[PDB]
Amino acid sequence: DSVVPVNNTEGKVMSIEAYQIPVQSNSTNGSQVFGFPLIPGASSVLNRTLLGEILNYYTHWSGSIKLTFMFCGSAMATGKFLLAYSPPGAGAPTTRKEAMLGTHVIWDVGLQSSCVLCIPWISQGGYITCWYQTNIVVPADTQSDCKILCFVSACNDFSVRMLKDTPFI
Amino acid sequence: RSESTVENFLCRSACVYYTTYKNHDNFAQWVINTRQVAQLRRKLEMFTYARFDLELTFVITSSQPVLTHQIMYVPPGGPVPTKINSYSWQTSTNPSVFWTEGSAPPRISIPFISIGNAYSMFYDGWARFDKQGTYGINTLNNMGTLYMRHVNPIVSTVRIYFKPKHVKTWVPRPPRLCQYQKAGNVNFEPSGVTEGRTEITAM
């Protein structure tokens, strides 16, 4: 597993902040927290991870991948997130309800500090989105927001076929 | 705990209908209904579903040689009188009793007759969803209607005594707090839960 630079927006790419998905405790209910195209060999989010780097040496590859989401708020913070997966070619949910009617998990951070997905298909696309089912409830007024870290690795027997020059020189 | 059983609580006679008619539109009628008497209604409404047979006893008196009266029962879906001489008074599928003054009062038994498996006391739905005025009407609760006439100037008075028998009930409910407003609905005036006191402490 390596840390995925999900928040790789302009101005964040040059900092450690690229890895830190912000969570606004008082955001609009049902809004999207984050999301991305699920492509390990092309997406800027995944193509520089340990998995992403290895696969850039091969012309063709396939297998499943594992995505781990870790919540880094205070011990006494609670609330729910909706982690949804959109199969290849299905586009991406536009609302929380649409995401809810597809394949997903409700992640209650008060019970589980992390949640793990294994995508049945990753090849040389699909989407991951996360929605604010609830706000984040805390016992006290804090100085800043909460962060989510995302990790990626190969999930099962992953295959590659033909070696090529890396595109990163 | 014998007086607490469902059968002892509900299997008791009540006067549910009082009416008069003359022997000179001169006929009486009553749609069988369990929401006409507040005490009967409040006990039955402590349940959501019920099955029972109905015993009906008729106390008939009259005032100004032998008077004969006809009491007709029209099952759900049967022909209905509109007139004292309507053909429906002679339908073979509408049972009737012929009784004369001086004998014991007429009595008949009507079995559970819904096509559902129970009568419902409450219905969170519509007879037809296209008509909002049908909210709360469950057509499966049609128990039939009674019609009363003299056989052939006097005034007759009829008291109908109703008694549920072999009563089975399901899904208990809170007793009503509010007074009843109408027989065709559950409408109420918002009401407090109890009588008040002057302070929360004892003495």
Add this chain to the structure above:
Amino acid sequence: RVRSITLGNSTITTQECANVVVGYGTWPTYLQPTQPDVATCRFYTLESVMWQQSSPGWWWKFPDALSNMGLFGQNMQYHYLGRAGYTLHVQCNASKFHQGCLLVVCVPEAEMGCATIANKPDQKSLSNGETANVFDSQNTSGQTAVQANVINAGMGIGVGNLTIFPHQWINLRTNNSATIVMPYVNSVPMDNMFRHNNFTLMIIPFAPLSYSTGATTYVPITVTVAPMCAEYNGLRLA
């Protein structure tokens, strides 16, 4: 300690120590050919509601609450006659610095009264589908409005007696959740799901929400619903 429950393509998390209330002691079972459908047995999570110090309570009518919910909602339209049981999971997100207490109750045949005695309540006032209706703290006024004053649960009874129906209490001091299993209850074995609401879910605070200064001003309440043993009339030749 923590249990992961997966139905179909949806997963939720509950605690292993959570209690389950099975209404009337009866588990849902399967029952003029009839066709079962297991393709709808997944969790449908409703939009959450926010519990404020002044909230009077919320309600949902069930066959209707799921009427827009994907395939379950579609079977209600393709078939004309059917039945189903439900598992209802109700959870609160609150800190140890929050206090309050809810009654979570499912009421069969919850026929509701109208604000105007002479009228009957309209269809939207009775149910807004997946959107919760709200109980009032005052008397309701309108011509087709549901009399929603919470004190009478909208039914003309005292609200403190709703405990006669399958229910669970949520005292934020000790628990933040409830699970209710509701069997199919009716006078007939199958019915038209668009002309009748088998039961209503009501969530009523009995102890107002409050909290320490600096704590979040509201508590989210989430309702997740999982149909069981759904059956519908067959649509084929004999």
Add this chain to the structure above:
Amino acid sequence: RVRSITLGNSTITTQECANVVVGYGTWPTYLQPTQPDVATCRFYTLESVMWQQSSPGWWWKFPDALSNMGLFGQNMQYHYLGRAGYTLHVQCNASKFHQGCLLVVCVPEAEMGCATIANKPDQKSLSNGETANVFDSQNTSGQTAVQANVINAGMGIGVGNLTIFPHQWINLRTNNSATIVMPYVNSVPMDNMFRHNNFTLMIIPFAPLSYSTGATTYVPITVTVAPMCAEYNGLRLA
């Protein structure tokens, strides 16, 4: 629940539920006569560092970090050739009202780049012995300075890929500690401990420290080191 560990004349306390990471799955073992020394197998606790909302991270080079540490530090001078493994205990002191997350990683042969491309970094910028060096949030500028911008871990790699090396995460929400067992790793069985740093310990925040109002503004981080199976060249006639 709580375990007391004594080595030599020093004692520390750890939790029984704490996890231990054994780098590369290998435990340290013993290996031209060579003399073992167990007199140095005690815990050496380094001065703690304070974690602020803006801290970029810290690092230590190990053979050097313990060079002034009593007898271990002396054996490095009396012997010219030797080897050792280490157990590293990293702990945080934080309340339940604090949040944040650290990566605690040990990196073999962590050769670091210079702020000036044409030059090589000086010895002090690479290591300040028992005193931690600090990563920068900005680009470093100097002629002999180590390029310490944390984003590249000072090595020219992305920092998110340091997880390839033996490591443990500390998420204050779930744990306040890490234990890493580092075997001796080199191209040769024994070396000169003053001309080579076998590994570097890096502590890098990935989720900034923050806290509720009124809580302590910083979190102390303590690093305790216990050498194992130390061996040095013999100093006697054959």
